[PDB]
Design a protein around this motif. Structure first.
Motif, PDB file in Angstrom:
ATOM      1  N   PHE A 121       9.538  -5.923  10.570  1.00 51.02           N
ATOM      2  CA  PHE A 121       9.346  -4.707   9.778  1.00 51.02           C
ATOM      3  C   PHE A 121       8.240  -3.797  10.301  1.00 51.02           C
ATOM      4  O   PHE A 121       7.289  -4.249  10.973  1.00 51.02           O
ATOM      5  CB  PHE A 121       9.112  -5.075   8.325  1.00 51.02           C
ATOM      6  N   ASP A 122       8.364  -2.510  10.022  1.00 52.81           N
ATOM      7  CA  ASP A 122       7.358  -1.572  10.485  1.00 52.81           C
ATOM      8  C   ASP A 122       6.151  -1.600   9.562  1.00 52.81           C
ATOM      9  O   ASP A 122       6.089  -2.401   8.656  1.00 52.81           O
ATOM     10  CB  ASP A 122       7.926  -0.157  10.722  1.00 52.81           C
ATOM     11  N   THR A 123       5.182  -0.743   9.813  1.00 54.89           N
ATOM     12  CA  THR A 123       3.921  -0.778   9.081  1.00 54.89           C
ATOM     13  C   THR A 123       4.109  -0.474   7.629  1.00 54.89           C
ATOM     14  O   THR A 123       3.605  -1.201   6.776  1.00 54.89           O
ATOM     15  CB  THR A 123       2.914   0.213   9.687  1.00 54.89           C
ATOM     16  N   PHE A 124       4.812   0.617   7.359  1.00 56.50           N
ATOM     17  CA  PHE A 124       5.061   1.079   5.999  1.00 56.50           C
ATOM     18  C   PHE A 124       5.787   0.013   5.188  1.00 56.50           C
ATOM     19  O   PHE A 124       5.365  -0.339   4.082  1.00 56.50           O
ATOM     20  CB  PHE A 124       5.884   2.386   6.065  1.00 56.50           C
ATOM     21  N   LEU A 125       6.852  -0.541   5.742  1.00 59.46           N
ATOM     22  CA  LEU A 125       7.627  -1.540   5.005  1.00 59.46           C
ATOM     23  C   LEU A 125       6.886  -2.875   4.962  1.00 59.46           C
ATOM     24  O   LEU A 125       6.998  -3.605   3.980  1.00 59.46           O
ATOM     25  CB  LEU A 125       9.040  -1.713   5.592  1.00 59.46           C
ATOM     26  N   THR A 126       6.124  -3.199   6.010  1.00 62.07           N
ATOM     27  CA  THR A 126       5.286  -4.410   5.958  1.00 62.07           C
ATOM     28  C   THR A 126       4.314  -4.366   4.770  1.00 62.07           C
ATOM     29  O   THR A 126       4.177  -5.354   4.041  1.00 62.07           O
ATOM     30  CB  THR A 126       4.541  -4.683   7.259  1.00 62.07           C
ATOM     31  N   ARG A 127       3.679  -3.224   4.540  1.00 58.10           N
ATOM     32  CA  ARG A 127       2.761  -3.129   3.409  1.00 58.10           C
ATOM     33  C   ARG A 127       3.462  -3.266   2.030  1.00 58.10           C
ATOM     34  O   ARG A 127       2.988  -3.982   1.172  1.00 58.10           O
ATOM     35  CB  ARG A 127       1.916  -1.842   3.470  1.00 58.10           C
ATOM     36  N   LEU A 128       4.574  -2.580   1.826  1.00 54.79           N
ATOM     37  CA  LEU A 128       5.340  -2.686   0.560  1.00 54.79           C
ATOM     38  C   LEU A 128       5.782  -4.103   0.259  1.00 54.79           C
ATOM     39  O   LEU A 128       5.658  -4.547  -0.869  1.00 54.79           O
ATOM     40  CB  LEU A 128       6.583  -1.784   0.563  1.00 54.79           C
ATOM     41  N   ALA A 129       6.277  -4.805   1.280  1.00 52.92           N
ATOM     42  CA  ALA A 129       6.730  -6.189   1.135  1.00 52.92           C
ATOM     43  C   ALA A 129       5.545  -7.106   0.884  1.00 52.92           C
ATOM     44  O   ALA A 129       5.619  -8.041   0.076  1.00 52.92           O
ATOM     45  CB  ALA A 129       7.483  -6.625   2.377  1.00 52.92           C
ATOM     46  N   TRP A 130       4.458  -6.855   1.606  1.00 53.19           N
ATOM     47  CA  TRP A 130       3.209  -7.580   1.378  1.00 53.19           C
ATOM     48  C   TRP A 130       2.734  -7.425  -0.080  1.00 53.19           C
ATOM     49  O   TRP A 130       2.426  -8.421  -0.748  1.00 53.19           O
ATOM     50  CB  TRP A 130       2.131  -7.155   2.385  1.00 53.19           C
ATOM     51  N   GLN A 131       2.702  -6.186  -0.555  1.00 55.92           N
ATOM     52  CA  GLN A 131       2.366  -5.853  -1.941  1.00 55.92           C
ATOM     53  C   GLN A 131       3.273  -6.572  -2.929  1.00 55.92           C
ATOM     54  O   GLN A 131       2.807  -7.120  -3.944  1.00 55.92           O
ATOM     55  CB  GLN A 131       2.547  -4.346  -2.163  1.00 55.92           C
ATOM     56  N   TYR A 132       4.573  -6.509  -2.645  1.00 52.62           N
ATOM     57  CA  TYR A 132       5.573  -7.134  -3.495  1.00 52.62           C
ATOM     58  C   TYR A 132       5.302  -8.629  -3.600  1.00 52.62           C
ATOM     59  O   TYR A 132       5.240  -9.173  -4.696  1.00 52.62           O
ATOM     60  CB  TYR A 132       6.996  -6.887  -2.976  1.00 52.62           C
ATOM     61  N   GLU A 133       5.120  -9.294  -2.461  1.00 51.03           N
ATOM     62  CA  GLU A 133       4.863 -10.733  -2.481  1.00 51.03           C
ATOM     63  C   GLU A 133       3.544 -11.094  -3.177  1.00 51.03           C
ATOM     64  O   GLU A 133       3.485 -12.069  -3.941  1.00 51.03           O
ATOM     65  CB  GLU A 133       4.928 -11.331  -1.078  1.00 51.03           C
ATOM     66  N   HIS A 134       2.496 -10.313  -2.922  1.00 50.06           N
ATOM     67  CA  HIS A 134       1.170 -10.644  -3.441  1.00 50.06           C
ATOM     68  C   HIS A 134       0.934 -10.301  -4.909  1.00 50.06           C
ATOM     69  O   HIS A 134       0.209 -11.025  -5.582  1.00 50.06           O
ATOM     70  CB  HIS A 134       0.067 -10.059  -2.555  1.00 50.06           C
ATOM     71  N   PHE A 135       1.553  -9.227  -5.403  1.00 61.75           N
ATOM     72  CA  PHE A 135       1.228  -8.690  -6.734  1.00 61.75           C
ATOM     73  C   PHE A 135       2.419  -8.337  -7.597  1.00 61.75           C
ATOM     74  O   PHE A 135       2.241  -7.850  -8.708  1.00 61.75           O
ATOM     75  CB  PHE A 135       0.325  -7.455  -6.613  1.00 61.75           C
ATOM     76  N   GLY A 136       3.625  -8.567  -7.090  1.00 62.00           N
ATOM     77  CA  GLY A 136       4.851  -8.280  -7.836  1.00 62.00           C
ATOM     78  C   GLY A 136       5.201  -6.807  -7.996  1.00 62.00           C
ATOM     79  O   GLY A 136       6.152  -6.476  -8.727  1.00 62.00           O
ATOM     80  N   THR A 137       4.445  -5.943  -7.310  1.00 60.00           N
ATOM     81  CA  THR A 137       4.615  -4.485  -7.343  1.00 60.00           C
ATOM     82  C   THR A 137       5.940  -3.985  -6.774  1.00 60.00           C
ATOM     83  O   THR A 137       6.209  -4.166  -5.575  1.00 60.00           O
ATOM     84  CB  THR A 137       3.544  -3.753  -6.500  1.00 60.00           C
ATOM     85  N   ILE A 138       6.746  -3.352  -7.634  1.00 63.21           N
ATOM     86  CA  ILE A 138       7.804  -2.424  -7.204  1.00 63.21           C
ATOM     87  C   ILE A 138       7.142  -1.038  -7.166  1.00 63.21           C
ATOM     88  O   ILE A 138       6.316  -0.743  -8.028  1.00 63.21           O
ATOM     89  CB  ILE A 138       9.016  -2.392  -8.194  1.00 63.21           C
ATOM     90  N   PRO A 139       7.473  -0.187  -6.166  1.00 68.02           N
ATOM     91  CA  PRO A 139       6.791   1.109  -6.167  1.00 68.02           C
ATOM     92  C   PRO A 139       7.468   2.145  -7.078  1.00 68.02           C
ATOM     93  O   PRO A 139       8.655   2.000  -7.409  1.00 68.02           O
ATOM     94  CB  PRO A 139       6.843   1.550  -4.691  1.00 68.02           C
ATOM     95  N   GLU A 140       6.699   3.176  -7.462  1.00 72.79           N
ATOM     96  CA  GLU A 140       7.131   4.227  -8.402  1.00 72.79           C
ATOM     97  C   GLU A 140       8.145   5.202  -7.791  1.00 72.79           C
ATOM     98  O   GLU A 140       9.276   5.314  -8.294  1.00 72.79           O
ATOM     99  CB  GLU A 140       5.917   4.987  -8.963  1.00 72.79           C
ATOM    100  N   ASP A 141       7.731   5.893  -6.720  1.00 76.04           N
ATOM    101  CA  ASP A 141       8.607   6.783  -5.925  1.00 76.04           C
ATOM    102  C   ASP A 141       9.969   6.124  -5.673  1.00 76.04           C
ATOM    103  O   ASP A 141      10.058   4.894  -5.607  1.00 76.04           O
ATOM    104  CB  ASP A 141       7.921   7.150  -4.589  1.00 76.04           C
ATOM    105  N   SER A 142      11.025   6.926  -5.548  1.00 74.57           N
ATOM    106  CA  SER A 142      12.359   6.372  -5.310  1.00 74.57           C
ATOM    107  C   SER A 142      12.633   6.048  -3.829  1.00 74.57           C
ATOM    108  O   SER A 142      13.333   5.076  -3.533  1.00 74.57           O
ATOM    109  CB  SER A 142      13.466   7.256  -5.928  1.00 74.57           C
ATOM    110  N   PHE A 143      12.086   6.846  -2.908  1.00 67.13           N
ATOM    111  CA  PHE A 143      12.230   6.570  -1.469  1.00 67.13           C
ATOM    112  C   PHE A 143      11.506   5.275  -1.083  1.00 67.13           C
ATOM    113  O   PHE A 143      11.971   4.521  -0.230  1.00 67.13           O
ATOM    114  CB  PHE A 143      11.744   7.748  -0.605  1.00 67.13           C
TER     115      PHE A 143
END
Lengths: 170, 171
Positions: A121-143
């Motif tokens: 995964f790239d940087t942007f998607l690595t961070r979202l997935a990292w966030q998801y795994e660590h804190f259960g965060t789905i992001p707000e924005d639709s993109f």
């Protein structure tokens, strides 16, 4: 000892991160990744002591008090430290880590784990997935949500990325 | 050829910079520095095609519409390219450069120079002094001003820092 030398790398990395954090923190989690060809991803999040919310390294610039170049200087030194650590680790161990995860606390407790997997995964998607795994965060924005689905569909197929995951009622 | 290989680094560096620039641009000025212990400073400014005002790399993040991580990704790739270049250059020629400056234009024209001096100034002051030498900028803010004075004091003694100066008898 080898253990103390690993502690020194931790202390040096933690200090550079602490230098960039503009406020009192309770906990920090750091992710660092470098492959054989020098492709690199690294970022940290920190738990603010006063708000009790997690804050991204990239959001610091919004509230920063010192000049940007001072922050970027520490960023550069941290990026250097990661690569320098990798070389030495590979000379000692015989092979490099591909990525690592480090958590540390206000109390001075830390842990560091090393991984040897390729990250697709790239940087942007690595961070979202990292966030998801660590804190259960789905992001707000639709993109951002759509982008996170790329990772989620990989997990649905039974793929695992332990390098970005943290460590009986009904 | 050595010439082709080295021009290929210049083009790769320019392309990484262009990927970060969020608008039409007429000109880019780039500074990069790394020493033997890996201590690094690098930055660029670019001249907007409309305004036409110079913009700092670090100010791009106020206007971008892509996620910050996309910009930080290109930043990281540029930073690696610099060190990778330096190391290959040292292997080939036997000694590394200490810093370099590059100017390039919309047309694909460019100029470059390599230096072998040590820079005693830090990141913040290096950019201030670099901006002072290229555009004659003197900062409004009084803290920024007194930081630049450290550099101007050296110049009052006849010291010169050609690694940060732009690349005749008229008045």
């Amino acid at each position: 000892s080898l253990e103390k030398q690993i502690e020194s790398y931790y202390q040096e990395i933690a200090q550079l991160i602490i230098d960039m954090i503009p406020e009192e923190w309770a906990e920090v989690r750091f992710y660092a990744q470098e492959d054989h060809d020098g492709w690199k991803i690294f970022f940290f999040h920190y738990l603010s002591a006063s708000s009790d919310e997690w804050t991204k390294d990239i959001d610091i610039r919004d509230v920063i008090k010192v000049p940007q170049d001072e922050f970027m200087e520490k960023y550069n030194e941290l990026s250097f430290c990661i690569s320098d650590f990798r070389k030495d680790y590979a000379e000692a161990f015989g092979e490099p880590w591909m990525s690592f995860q480090m958590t540390f606390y206000a109390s001075g407790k830390f842990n560091i784990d090393f991984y040897y997997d390729k990250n697709p995964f790239d940087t942007f998607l690595t961070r979202l997935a990292w966030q998801y795994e660590h804190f259960g965060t789905i992001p707000e924005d639709s993109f951002y949500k759509e982008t996170l689905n790329e990772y989620l569909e990989e997990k649905a197929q039974g793929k695992r990325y332990p390098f970005l995951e943290p460590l009986h009622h009904h």
